[PDB]
Amino acid sequence: PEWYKSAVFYELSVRTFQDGNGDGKGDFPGLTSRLDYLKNLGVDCLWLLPWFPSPLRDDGYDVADYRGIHPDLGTLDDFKVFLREAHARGLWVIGDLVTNHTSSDHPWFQAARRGPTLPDGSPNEYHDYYVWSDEGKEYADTRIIFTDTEVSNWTLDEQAGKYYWHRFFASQPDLNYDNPKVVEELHGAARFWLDLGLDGFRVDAVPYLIEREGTSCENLPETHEILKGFRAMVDREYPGRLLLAEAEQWPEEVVEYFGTEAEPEFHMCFNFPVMPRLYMSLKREDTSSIREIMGRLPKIPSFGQWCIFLRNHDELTLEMVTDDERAFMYAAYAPDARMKINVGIRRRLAPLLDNDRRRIELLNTVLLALPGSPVLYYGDEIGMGDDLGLPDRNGVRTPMQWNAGTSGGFSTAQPSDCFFPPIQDPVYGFGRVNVQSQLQDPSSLLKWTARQLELRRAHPAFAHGDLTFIETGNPAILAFTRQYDGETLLIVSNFAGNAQAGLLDLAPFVGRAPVTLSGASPLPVVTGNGQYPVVMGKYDYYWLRLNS
Amino acid sequence: PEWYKSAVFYELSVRTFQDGNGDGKGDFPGLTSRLDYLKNLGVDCLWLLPWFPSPLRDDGYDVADYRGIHPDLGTLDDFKVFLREAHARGLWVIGDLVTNHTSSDHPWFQAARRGPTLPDGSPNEYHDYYVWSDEGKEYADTRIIFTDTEVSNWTLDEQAGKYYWHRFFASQPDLNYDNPKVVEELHGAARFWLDLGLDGFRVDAVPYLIEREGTSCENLPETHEILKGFRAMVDREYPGRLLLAEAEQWPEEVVEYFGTEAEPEFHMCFNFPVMPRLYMSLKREDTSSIREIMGRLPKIPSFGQWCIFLRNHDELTLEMVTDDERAFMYAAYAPDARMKINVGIRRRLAPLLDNDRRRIELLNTVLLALPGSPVLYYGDEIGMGDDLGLPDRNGVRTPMQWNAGTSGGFSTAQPSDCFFPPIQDPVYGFGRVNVQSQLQDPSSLLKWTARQLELRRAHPAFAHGDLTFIETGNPAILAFTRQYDGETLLIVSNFAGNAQAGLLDLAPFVGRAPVTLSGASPLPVVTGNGQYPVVMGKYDYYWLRLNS
Ligand SMILES: [Ca+2]
Ligand SMILES: [Ca+2]
Ligand SMILES: [Mg+2]
Ligand SMILES: [Mg+2]
Fold first, then answer.
1. For residue A128, what are the contacts with CB-CB under 8 A and spacing of at least 6?
2. Cα torsion at A162, A167, A171, A175 (round to 10°)?
3. Which ligand is in closest contact with the Cα of B178?
């Protein structure tokens, strides 16, 4: 199998991970000094949030120069040196190719807003790089994604005197992909970084490339054609590199971003369908949704691989769930109106689960058992907290907490002088939660994560095997098998907060002796009926092999 | 039933709990301000460590005035107010009556070491308050209890020119209970405090009162008869008051300290027999030794109630276990030779269990479900650690950690200036393990202890009911029932570090459904055979009720 099927991804922001020069802002030298950490955690691949020059009105997803490194973060030679030292430690590295849009402050748009004609008479090449309208009347059949800041997907530019289109901030005008000169430019943006050694791209907001009147302007076929073109390029010109879709849609729509095998698109897609159901199942102590949503996922092509994740740098999205489910999830997980944003909840993993470690562990054993490659949001392995006094999703992006010293080890600058301020509240602050402490605690959450990644690493079934739900007879107990090679694993997870009993249907496994993946603790051999009784305490997870 | 059969006890030392005036030493004004915390924790009786005038050569167990308050700790009026404020909250308060010995700085011993006759010529009333010998020959049978420090229980006195007896430090001369004027004085001391309102006493070192040649000078008949006289005193003059005994002996000799319904002695004794066997059971993953020592305990009288604990201000003592048993506790639990003191281990509960919460929760639920009244050591409810850089068991007595402020909130004094210096290492120090953090943390070990004493309080079978083990068919799992009034409880606990299976023998409960005490989750009904399949994760505890 390909390398990315086996990997554990780890998602960090250069700017909030480690500061190297005391300016209060994370940078590449700082990241480079921390690399042994990620090596020894069990991480295989760094996913870096955007590092490009940018005015940071969406924290770097408003790219202003696809071919550089933001001054805050180091120089291009810094990047080159970090990329060298990552590969010297067996870490693959992938970027963010922000394809749908650029900053208002990108040269292309500053040039596009001059008009169709230049003041001499000749055409303005760059005007048609972007999406203009004289009235802004087009595409009304579309939803606004940033509901808490934007009123229209059309904004009037003062200079061009007409309306430009954007699915996100008006800082971030949409690029016009019916212009093949623009498709050129981002093949060329990709080649620039692929030639430097980068192993792949998270591609940003792929469902929103092409708009069309009288459609939802999401997931359209021509969008997939643009994306097949990217895969065609990378397969020919840089074999073995990764393409990783951020497609946040319903499951029938998400499987499309893989593509047939005769004409492929991405290699991997995030499993946005299950992420909200993991949390919902917890509060309801009912796993039905998990199995039904895993149910609506087709078989995917040979080269395909899901990226399973719990949280990340954006809010917990709720835009692809039922009106009912969404209401439930706010009631269970956003008690304060301050916790809500944009059809979503902006909290880090540990506070969503009340800092209860039995629950955090439970959800992480599922992340690593469900089929795919698991990606970890930085700091979620020491149990970091949110800071909601910060605006718009910055609250979950606070600086990494390395030790109990100045700014938690993030900078020698004072927390006031940090890009976002290091958390110091009595529960989740760097005085209580930091890596130093958990390296010297025999029992810490950092240690526990590393151990389960070893344990996952020691059974290739978890990364490569099939999935089959077995029926338990009690919706608080979710159970499934994963088979690959001789291995057949059995994973039983109790989503309720008191003891539960189930009656696992294991008729296909009569004769087999289940034992524990930690020290092969023996269980009764499955016999006759196939119907196996089990009892489980609070949030327990049995990880088991079915000999022979 | 009497109050002490229902109480939760909390052990603490006034000197290391709360400083009031920032002089570095804890004091009764500071303790009074924290009674809200103790009441809210669900504690019922405070047990205080000795608070008398003294030179603290054994943290005040070497007493130099029975009817004063050590000035480190306040005035006798500060003590009255504390006592008034504790009762005003429905809290009992018991003291420590050090009976066997007095400081060498006690007025008595200063007088007694002057000889059997004064200079003027009349007899010295005080000389016989202590046990003198001219040779040191006598009582050659006895063992030294402070094995690391004293070579001889006899010590020459420079001034009296003859040897004096001490079972503990040389600076703690033994009182002589063959003089009835000593029994007189300690009845009067005992009265002094009971007249002020104290709800009883822990009597210290009871086995070693009277010494007789040709015996071990422990547990003697004449030591019990002195003690029957104490019970008789409080029985008559102060009905209600608890007598409580520290008797660190094998089970048959421990049970003598209650002393039949005909002429009673103590209302309560520390269950020293089970404690080593709980720790040893956890590391063998084999609970047999817990059942064996509950068996060898004979039934105690009607007024009697065990005192169950895990840790306390002394070392985890091993003086009363096998050579093999002791070798296993030393190997499993004392990797540094330094952690050994006086046949036993000087470490706090959280270090002993590798700071592992699943394990701390395990033992504590066992503390709460075994018959007896449970006593908690101060700060093991937040998971405090130890400081081996202090001498002679003081490592487990560092100041309480209230918050992350100046000395963990124990004082405005710098930690260099505290009586003992607050713990500050990266795992257990007060920047990470403190009460502020855990009152604010939804899922803290403190909140856990409270929510888990409330469960205990909600079921009088825990306090009063019987005890019956059941057979589980797997020595890793420890099950018992407890029955009182309607209620039959069923407590199943896994002592292994990975999932275990067992077949519980529930034959006399067929037709009956076990249900969960938390959130009333019912399990499969016990049927036909009675043989109940169960599975259990890492250090699980099932607290169940049996309908109907
Ligand atoms: Ca677009
Ligand atoms: Ca004595
Ligand atoms: Mg910097
Ligand atoms: Mg003081």
1. A112, A116, A176, A179, A181
2. -70
3. 2
Q: What is the CATH number of the domain that holds B539?
A: 2.60.40.1180
Six token digits for residue A267: 């290699």
- What contacts B302, CB < 8 A, 6 or more positions away? B261
- Residue B239 and residue B295 share a domain: yes
* Mutate which: B535, B538, B540, B541, vs A, most A CBs within 10 A: B535
| CATH number, domain containing residue B11 | 3.20.20.80
Domain region containing B165: 101-174
Residues of chain A neighbouring B440 (CB-CB closer than 8 A): 425-427
Question: Taking a C-beta distance cutoff of 8 angstroms, is the pair B307, B9 a contact?
Answer: yes
| Cβ–Cβ gap B354/A522 under 8 Å | no
| Count of domains for chain A | 3
Number of helices (H) and strands (E) in chain B: give both, helices first: 15, 20
Residues B209 and B326 in one domain: yes
**CB distance A97 to A190 below 8 Å:** yes
- Please give the distance, rounded to the nearest whole angstrom, from the Cα atom of residue A172 to the centre of ligand 1: 10
- Residues in chain B whose Cβ is within 8 Å of chain A: 354-357, 403-404, 426-427, 431-432, 436-437, 440-444, 496-501, 516, 518-519, 521, 523-524, 533-538, 540-542, 544
- The experimental resolution of this structure, in angstroms, equals 3.0
End-to-end CA distance of chain A: 25
Residue A163 CA to ligand 1 center (angstroms) comes to 14
Count CB pairs under 8 A between chains A and B: 104
Non-local CB neighbours of A310 within 8 Å, separated by 6+ positions: A275, A278, A349, A363, A364, A367, A377, A380
Let me know whether A245 and A369 are in one domain: yes
For residue A243, the SS3 value is: strand
Expt. technique: X-ray
